[PDB]
Structures are given as C-alpha cells and as structure tokens.
Design a protein around this ligand. Structure first.
Ligand SMILES: CN1CCN(c2ncnc3[nH]ccc23)[C@@H](CO)C1
Length: 167
C-alpha cells in the first residue's frame, strides 16, 4: 500500500492520473520523481522547467555541478539526483526529443531506467515539448516498465484520449 490517490489502473504495475506532476510530488513526497530531462540537465521548460521552478532553482544549481563533473547524459540515459522539496530523489531521464531528430527507438531505453526503482511518480517520456506521440509513449511505458509507475498527465484532454485509446 502506498499514498498515491485517484489513479486509474492500466495494468498490474502502471497507473495513470490527470494531474500536475509538481502538485502531485508536493502532496505525495514520493521516493522517486522522474524528470523529463535533456542531456545537459538544462531545465528550461516543459516538465523539467516546472519541477525546477518548484525547487526555487535548486535543481538547476545541483544539475550544473553534476554536468561540470560528469559531462552530459546519453539520450536514453539517466542520473539520480536530489528530489529537493518534491521527493527523496529525482531520476532525471532523457527521452529522445523528436524536435531534435533523435531516434524514437531510444524511448524504450529511456523507460528501462525506471526498472531500477521499485516505485516512481513520472511523466510520459518524450511527450509534450519533446515531440513524440504520447499514445506511443504510454505503450512503450507499459511494455517496458516492470516496477510500479504512477503517471501524471497534465492535459485533461490528453489524459482522456490516453485512457479511451488504451489497449
Ligand atoms: C507528455 N506531456 C508533457 C507535459 N505534461 C505534464 N504532465 C505532468 N506534469 C506536468 N508539469 C508540467 C508539464 C506537465 C503533460 C501534458 O499536460 C504530459
């Protein structure tokens, strides 16, 4: 039993809700919140910009030190950093950005990072400003993640379409 509330159950391990991931994280304080990161951990917009804003830019400060030490992530890769005031940990995961021409096959590799964590609050990878089809992202999530994932979908219209079209 966990404290996630109001989710629709899609499969044995995947749950979904129309919610602002920032507000969900502040309420639940999950062990792991997933960020829709880029390889430079530049949290300018989309989910990343919103999460970073909610940390008063502390996420960005920590991220800049991480990059200065380690260099950029790989597309499809991840790193674990602090969750600041939102969660114990933030798993920064880089899905392919279609608006940069990156290979959508890397979306499965991106979701594989979730399997290193027993329970996560997450957005749909590569959705939103990353330019991928969110219906496809949900399919890859369900077919790749085996740990317990609670998906927050900001857009109510999109949430309804994801549920109604889910196979
Ligand atoms: C795939 N898209 C991208 C972003 N988005 C979010 N989902 C949850 N929390 C969020 N905070 C800022 C954006 C955002 C959904 C659309 O409302 C899904």
């Amino acid at each position: 039993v966990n404290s996630f509330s109001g989710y629709l159950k899609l499969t044995d391990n995947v749950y979904i809700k129309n919610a602002d991931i920032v507000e969900e994280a502040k309420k639940v304080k999950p062990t792991v919140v997933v960020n829709a990161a880029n390889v430079y951990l530049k949290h300018g917009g989309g989910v990343a910009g919103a999460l970073n804003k909610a940390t008063n830019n502390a996420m960005q400060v920590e991220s800049d030190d991480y990059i200065a030490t380690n260099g950029p992530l790989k597309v499809g890769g991840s790193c674990v950093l602090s969750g600041h005031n939102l969660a114990k940990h933030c798993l920064h995961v880089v899905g392919p950005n279609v608006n940069k021409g990156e290979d959508i096959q890397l979306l499965k590799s991106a979701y594989e990072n979730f399997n290193q964590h027993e329970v996560l609050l997450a957005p749909l990878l590569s959705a939103g400003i990353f330019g991928a089809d969110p219906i496809h992202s949900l399919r890859v999530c369900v077919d790749t993640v085996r740990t317990n994932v609670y998906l927050a979908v900001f857009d109510k219209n999109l949430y309804d379409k994801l549920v109604s079209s889910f196979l």
